[PDB]
Amino acid sequence: SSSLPSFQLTNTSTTYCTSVTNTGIYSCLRTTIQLKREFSFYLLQLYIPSCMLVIVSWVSFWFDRTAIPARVTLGVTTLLTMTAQSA
Amino acid sequence: GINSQLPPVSYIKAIDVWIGACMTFIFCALLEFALVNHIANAGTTEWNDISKRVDLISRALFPVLFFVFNILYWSRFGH
Ligand SMILES: CC[C@H](C)[C@H]1O[C@]2(CC[C@@H]1C)C[C@@H]1C[C@@H](C/C=C(\C)[C@@H](O[C@H]3C[C@H](OC)[C@@H](O[C@H]4C[C@H](OC)[C@@H](O)[C@H](C)O4)[C@H](C)O3)[C@@H](C)/C=C/C=C3\CO[C@@H]4[C@H](O)C(C)=C[C@@H](C(=O)O1)[C@]34O)O2
Ligand SMILES: *[C@@H]1O[C@H](CO)[C@@H](O)[C@H](O)[C@H]1NC(C)=O
Ligand SMILES: CCCCCCCCCCC
Ligand SMILES: CCCCCCCC
The missing domain is CATH 1.20.58.390 (Neurotransmitter-gated ion-channel transmembrane domain)
Structure with a gap:
């Protein structure tokens, strides 16, 4: 947060984004950060x-x-x- | 110009205090013009010589106050 002066990292989440494609179904993780503008x-x-x-x-x-x-x-x-x- | 080479932060920089202050001195100059000019065209000579008085005071008050500001500013941030 000290190397991120312009924003404030308010919240984080940990989710899944497994998707079905034309070559098959691929497992997928998704980490998400929420940025609040100073x-x-x-x-x-x-x-x-x-x-x-x-x-x-x-x-x-x-x-x-x-x-x-x-x-x-x-x-x-x-x-x-x-x-x-x-x- | 100065503020463009800087990253947006969450605190007030000493540079901001100094820009904002000088800004005020010039803003109050304008205000002074308006004040003087408004009470000058007033019919009575009662206000007219008050108008004159405002300038006389300003010619000295402004410099003195700006000097006082500099002293306070530099002692506070030049440390
Ligand atoms: C005051 C606004 C009116 C319009 C006046 O503007 C002028 C003159 C005309 C009006 C009367 C011109 C203006 C400066 C102000 C005078 C302001 C100061 C001397 C300082 O600030 C004051 C007020 C400020 O609180 C508004 C206060 O902070 C408190 C409260 C805040 O929360 C409400 C909170 O966040 C904070 C943590 O603690 C502060 C301590 O002290 C000084 C800091 C202001 C600098 C302003 C600027 C510096 O560069 C900016 C920009 O690059 C530009 C081109 C214009 C400048 C400007 O806009 O110049 C500028 O934005 O007067
Ligand atoms: C952060 O927190 C709030 C409340 O829990 C929530 O609404 C928001 O979706 C979260 N943001 C992220 C990116 O996790
Ligand atoms: C009696 C009025 C005297 C006014 C003197 C003003 C001097 C201003 C100098 C600003 C650098
Ligand atoms: C810090 C702001 C100072 C403003 C002084 C104005 C005097 C005319």
């Missing part, structure tokens, strides 16, 4: 920065309606950035 990374690298990005688009609601260049620069920038992050 969330801390996606919290910090996706969700947090996107909320922070969406929140910035709001601070333009507090600029006078006359200074629209400021509003556009905010809305457009955050939007473009949002794209990049997604890519």
